[PDB]
Amino acid sequence: DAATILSDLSTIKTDINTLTQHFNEFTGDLLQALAAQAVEQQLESDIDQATADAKATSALSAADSTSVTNALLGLKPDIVTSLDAIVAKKPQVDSAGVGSLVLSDLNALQSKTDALSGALQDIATATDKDTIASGTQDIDAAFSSAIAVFS
Ligand SMILES: CCCCCCCCCCCCCCCC(=O)O
Ligand SMILES: *[C@H]1O[C@H](CO)[C@@H](O)[C@H](O)[C@@H]1O
C-alpha cells in the first residue's frame, strides 16, 4: 500500500531530524549518548518497518511510484545533515569513548537503508527505479564518508 509506505517514510524523516537535534546538543556526556542511541534504535526499527511494508506492496501505480520516489529522495538532505552533525561531534564522541557505537550504528543504518531502497526500487516504475538508485548511490557515499571519519 503506497499510503503506508509514505507514512513509514515520514516517520523515518522525523526520526532522522530528532537524531540530528541530539547530535547538535551532544557535549560528550554518556547519558546524552544513551538518549541519542534510543532514537537511533527507533530509526533502525522504522527503516525495517518500511522495508517490510514495501515488500508487502504490489507494483506501484505511476502516481504512487512518484510519491514514494519523492518521499525517499526527500530524505537525502536530512540524511546528509544528520551525518554531518555527528561527524562535527567526533571530538565529543572520542571524549565520551563511544566511537565504536557510532560506527556500529552507521554500518547497521547503511545496510538497512540499502535494503529499503532495494525494496522500493523493486515496486517502482522503471524510470523511478533509476532515480531511486542514483539517489541511493549518493546516500551510500555519505554513509561511507561518515564511516571513514569514525574508523
Ligand atoms: C536513512 C537513515 C539516515 C541516518 C543518518 C544518521 C546516522 C547517524 C548514525 C550515528 C548514530 C549514533 C547514535 C549514538 C551515539 C551518539 O549520538 O553519541
Ligand atoms: C563525507 O560526507 C559526510 C556526510 O555528508 C561528511 O560529514 C564528511 O565531512 C565528508 O564530506
Distance (Å) from CA 83 to ligand 2 centroid: 7
Rounded to whole angstroms, the Cα distance separating 9 from 47 reads 8
CA of 129 to the centre of ligand 2 (A): 25
Sign of CA dihedral 119, 123, 126, 127: negative
Top mutation candidate among 16, 24, 76, 86 for ligand 1, by most atoms within 8 Å of CB: 86
From 90, 149, 150, 151, give the residue whose CB has the most ligand 2 atoms within 8 Å, as the site to mutate. Answer: 149
Q: How far apart are CA 99 and CA 33, in angstroms?
A: 11
- 144-150: long-range pairs with CB below 8 Å, 24+: 144/110, 145/83, 145/87, 146/83, 146/86, 146/87, 146/106, 147/103, 147/106, 147/107, 147/110, 149/87, 149/90, 150/87, 150/90, 150/93, 150/99, 150/102, 150/103, 150/106
Domain that holds residue 75: 1-151
- Residue 76's identity, in one-letter code, is K
Experimental method, per PDB record: X-ray
| Residue 100 one-letter amino acid | S
In contact, 113 and 47? CB cutoff 8 Å: yes
Alpha carbon distance 121, 105 (integer Å) = 24
* Cell numbers representing residue 141 in the block: 557515499
Identify whether the C-beta of residue 149 lies closer than 8 Å to the C-beta of residue 84: no
Provide the domain count of the chain.
1
Nearest CA to ligand 2 atom 8: 145
CB-based contact 131:73 (threshold 8 Å): yes
First-to-last CA distance in the chain? 39
